[model samples]
Target: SHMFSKFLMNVKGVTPRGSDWANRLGPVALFGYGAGMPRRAPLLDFFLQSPRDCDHYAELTIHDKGPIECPPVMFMPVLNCGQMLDEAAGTETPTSDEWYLGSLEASTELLEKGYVPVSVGGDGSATLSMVEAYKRLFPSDDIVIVHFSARPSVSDPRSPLRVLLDKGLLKGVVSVGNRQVSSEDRKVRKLHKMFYMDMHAIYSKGLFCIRDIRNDYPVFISIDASVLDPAFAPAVDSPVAGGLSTRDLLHIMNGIRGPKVVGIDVYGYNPDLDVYRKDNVGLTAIALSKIIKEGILKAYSISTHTEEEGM
Candidate 1:
C-alpha cells in the first residue's frame, strides 16, 4: 500500500493492491507529484487525500477491471517532493525550476518501468516534467499534448507548453476548455504550431478536432482542474466562469479516438480553497477517478490490444 493510502478515501469495493496476488500486471500506475507555487497556496499534493473529508458517494466508487476492458490501475507512493525541495532550497519555498528538475528525474523511473504513467498533480509543474521525461526517453518519437485548462499555461515562459515548445518536442498541442486568452496568446495560437480549441469549439465541433494527431505518435493528456466550471470544481486556484461541465469533460475524454496515450497528468487542484466550501474535492475526486476508468484506462487497453493484434 502507498504511504499516503491511510489519508485516501477507503471506498468499500475498490482494492488498493493490484497486479500482485493475481500475478498479472496492471497497465497503468498512478502517482501523486505536485509542486506548490509559493506565491499561491501549498499542499496540492494532498489531492487524493481530499476525498476523505467528504461523505462517501456511490458515484465516486471505482471498481477493479481486467486489463482487457480497461487497464487495472495500481496506486504508487506519492513522491516525497515538497520536503526534499525545502531541504535543498534551505527554505520552505522551492523554486519552480528545482521542482521541475526533481519531478523530471523522479518520473523517469516510472516511464522506464513500461506502465502508462498517470501523474496526479500538485500543479502543472509536474506535467511539464513528465512531458520532458517522455521526450528524453523516446527522442525520435513525436509527442502531442491534449491540454485541458481554463487558462492556457503556455503564455508564460515558465509553463509546460512553452518549455516543451522551446525544445521542439511537441508535434502539436490540442488545447481545450481554455476560456481566457490574451492578444499575444491568440496570435501565438493562430500559428500552425498548435491547435487552439476552446470550450466553444469543443461544444460545437466535438473533441476530435485535433488536426495534427496521427495514430502512430505518442499523445499525452494534460488536465488542470480549472478546466471544469467553478460550479463543478471551485477548489481550483483560478476558477473560471463558463468552463466545461464535469460531464462534458468526461464525454470529451471518452470520445477521444486516435493517437495512443503515452502519459497523462491531472493537475491544478487546490485543497486550500476547499477548506470552508462544499465538497469540491469530493467532486474532483469523483470526476478524476471516473475519467481514469472510462477514459485513460480504456485508451491504454485499446492501445495494447491493437499492438497485440499486429504482432
Candidate 2:
C-alpha cells in the first residue's frame, strides 16, 4: 500500500480547476524522463517508493496531519527517449538531438492540452527538452526561468540558458540557491540579464527578487537536486559540499509569487549513488512532491496583471 502505484490507484477524480480553485490552473500532470541519464535510469523507481506523507521528518512539520488543499494531480507514464535501458549503463547512451524528440513531443502535448507538467528527470540535462517544449508551445510569450542549482550553468556553451538565448525563447533567468560561483559566472550572468542569488543572499533574505517579478510573462522552475546540501541530497550526480538545507529550500519554493508558473521539473538525482537507499531517495522524493504541490499552488494563488492594467 505504501507503493506509488498503490497511492495512484486511489486517485479517482482529476477534475480541472473551477471558480473555487481561484487563480490556480491544473490538473497537474506528472511524468518521468530518464533517457537523458547515463546511469541513473532507476531513479524514478526509487522515487516511487516514497510515502506520500513525510512522517520520516517529524521535526519539520510544514505538512501537518490535517487535511490540506490540493489540486488535481495525475500521474502519466514515463517518457520514452527511444533508447534501451542497457545503453544507459555508460557513456554509450545516445544523446543526440533526435534521441530526445519523444520527450519534447510528449511535454509539448501536455502544455498544449492546458495541463501543468511536473517532471522528474534522471539528470539536470533533461531540463533542456522540457524548456524547449515550453518554447514550442508558447512561441510568443516572454518566458522567465527560475533555476535552482549549485552552479548556474551559464558558462557552458551547450547550456539551456545559451540555447534559449540563441533561439530568442528566453526573457530572463533568475538563478537561486547557487553556491559554486565565481567572477566569471558573474560576468556571464550580467551579460545575459541573469539574476544571480547565492546561498548567502538566501540566508540573509529569502529569494526577494522572486516576489518582485512584476512581468506578465510565464515562469519555469527548474530544480537541480544538487542545490540542496550534500548532507540532505547526497544522491545527486554532482553533490555540492555546502548548499541550502531542506527546510530553507522549501521556504523559498513556497514563497514564490506573481507571474504564472507554467511548469516545474526536479532533476539531478542519481539513485545509484544512494548507497544507504533509506534516506536519500525518500528525502528527494519528498522534496519533489512538496515542490510540485507548491508550484501548482502558485498558479492558483498568484494573479498576473493584464496589459490593460498598465494604463
Candidate 3:
C-alpha cells in the first residue's frame, strides 16, 4: 500500500480504488518494473490491492512479486530497451533475460488461475517473452506475431521477434503498418520477407488485416507507438515521418478478433518526448485502456455489450 503511492500519484483521473471505470470494465491490475531500471517498490504497491475487495480494478506494481498467484486483469509497464541499449554501449547493460524469465513465471501463474496475461512492454521486444510464454503453455499451437512499426526492428538485440527468428523459437510473423525503412533495415526486411503493409499500401487497401493467422494458435500483438505517424504520436523515441493515424491504428486494432489471441503488448511511447499533446501520460493511459477494452474485453465479449459499449 505504501509502495503503490507513487503509481497512485501519477494517475490523475481516478485512483484504482473506487473508480467506476474498473467496476464496469472488469478487474484491472498493473505490472511495474522491467529491463534497464531497478525494481521500484512504489510500483508494486499499486498492484497489491484486490479487485474483489476494491470497488474498482486493482493496480499492482510488480517488482519482487515473483509471479502472479491468480489471474486478475493484468497490465505490464513498457520497458525501454533503448535505454538498455544505450547502457550496453557505454557500459554493461542489463538484459531482459531475467525479467523475461520472471514474466514467464508470472504467465504460468496466470494460466494456472485461468487468467490472461496482458503485458505493457518497455520496448517492442518484450513481445518475445509473452510469445515464449504462450509457446510453453501450448507447444503444438501456432503463434502469430503482429507488429505495427515505422521501422523494421523495434530495438536491436532487444528485438525479441528477430531474436526468436534467429533462434528458431518463432515460426511465423506478420508485420503491418510499416511506412518508412532505412537501407539496412530494408535489407533485413527483404531477408525475412516479413508480411508488410506500407502506409501507401494501407491507404490504398483502406483495410489492413493480419490474414491467415492459424486459428489453432494464439496471437501475440506488439504495438509500437512509433508505428503511428509523427504527427499523431510524436513522443516515441524513434518517430517516423509517415505512419498510421490514431483512427487508423484503432481500426487496425479493432479488426483483430478471436480467442487465438493469448497476449498483447503496447510499447515505444516515451512520455518525456511527447510535446504535441499535453498530459501525454494521461493520454497514453486512456489509449491503452481503450485498446484493452476494445481488443480484449469487447472482442471476447467478456462483459455485456451494453456495459462494454460505454468504454
Q: List the residue pairs that clash in candidate 1.
A: 34-122
Select the stronger candidate by lDDT from 1 and 2. 2
Best model number under TM-score: 2
Give the per-residue lDDT of model 2 (tens digit) for 7-107. 22222123332344355454355556565454445544444443333322211112211122343533212111221233324454445454356456555
What is the C-alpha local distance difference test score of each model? 0.58, 0.59, 0.51
**Model 1 agreement with the true structure over 138-226: per-residue lDDT tens digits:** 88878878888988777777667788887778888888788888777876676636776787767677654422333455778888888
Q: What is candidate 2's TM-score against the reference?
A: 0.71
> Runs in model 1 with CA error above 4 Å?
1-26, 37-93, 205-214, 275-282, 292-296, 302-311
Candidate 3 positional error at 239, Å: 1.0
Write down the lDDT that model 2 would get. Answer: 0.59
For each candidate, what TM-score against the reference?
A: 0.69, 0.71, 0.63
Q: Residue 267: error of model 2 in Å?
A: 0.5
Better model by TM-score, 1 or 2?
A: 2
